[PDB]
Amino acid sequence: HVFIRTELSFIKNNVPCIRDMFFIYKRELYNICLDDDETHIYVQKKVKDSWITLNDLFKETDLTGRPHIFAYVDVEEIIILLCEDEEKKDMTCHRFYSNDGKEYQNSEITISDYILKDKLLSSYVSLPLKIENREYFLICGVSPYKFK
Amino acid sequence: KDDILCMASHDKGETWGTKIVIKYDNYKLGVQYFFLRPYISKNDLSFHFYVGDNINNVKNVNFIECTHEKDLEFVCSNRDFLKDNKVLQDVSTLNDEYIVSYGNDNNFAECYIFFNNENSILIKPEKYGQTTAGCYGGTFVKIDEQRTLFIYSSSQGIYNIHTIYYANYE
């Protein structure tokens, strides 16, 4: 009937990350770390006991501030998106693609009049959502009520 | 009038022209959601986010489940995970059953993990030294239908990784 098991391992990180972001890829464990003067967006991997910086995606960008991050892990493919924090009317982002977790391939895109014009967003990892024979990745946002 | 809104892509992020509508017919007006994120597994869409419209100004997790109407329009609904003497934290699923994370109080001296609201495990993080180590920010990182990690940073630099196996039969 019931089987429950618990183990504890420790990991140290070179980088004191402002925000951690965890994903499993090929049963390896990967992190998207964020330090912050000076800033980076490091793609890291746990080989046992320590994280290992594999990429800096911030470098390959014309990106002025701190972006929202939307990561998506299909089984074979990893797709990450760095989206500039508003505040125009359309939103630009830079995406990175791998099928291997080591070598991420640059790019840049723009969504004009994008649907989330006045929505607040925050970074997250996710999976494709099957909706009648189609896979969709979602970027979702919330209405701004608190006075600013 | 929909408080939550998703733009969506079926071309693996090339274009974001698709629009997914989220009717969360909630009772309250003008309530700010924080740190919203969709929890997705197989067919099911759900959302995990915070609200702070309570006495203490402390933020509080809400988790809403959604089912389907149109090909792009979902209908969501709050899921009760309230639990006396504990505070709702993170949410995941092992094998079409919820696994749920809780703190003892809002200061996460301890974290309890509940399986299908039916069995539970206690996580008492060890101290980093002279200062208290909590499990603030503990989240789930799912591996497959029997295994998930529960990670949190006791203090800066230090990553506490709980490897968890669970299986319920019959």
Residue numbers in the entry:
A (entry chain A): 32 to 67, 73 to 123, 128 to 188
B (entry chain E): 193 to 362
Sentences from the paper on this structure:
In order to crystallize PfCyRPA, we needed to pre-treat the protein with Actinase E. The crystal structure of PfCyRPA, determined to a resolution of 2.5 Å (detailed in Supplementary file 1), confirmed our biophysical analyses. Each blade of the propeller is constructed by a four-stranded anti-parallel β-sheet. The five disulfide bonds in PfCyRPA are located within blades 2–6, stabilizing each individual blade. The first blade has no disulfide bond; it is formed by β-strands from the N- and C-terminal regions of PfCyRPA, potentially enabling conformational changes in PfCyRPA by opening and closing. A domain alignment search (DALI; [Holm and Rosenström, 2010]) for related structures revealed that PfCyRPA adopts a heavily modified sialidase/neuraminidase fold.
PfCyRPA is part of a multi-protein complex including also the PfRH5-interacting protein PfRipr and the reticulocyte binding-like homologous protein PfRH5, which binds to the erythrocyte receptor basigin. Moreover, PfCyRPA-specific monoclonal antibodies (mAb) inhibit parasite growth both in vitro and in vivo by blocking merozoite invasion. Here, we describe the crystal structure of the promising vaccine candidate PfCyRPA alone and in complex with the antigen-binding fragment (Fab) of the parasite growth inhibitory mAb c12.
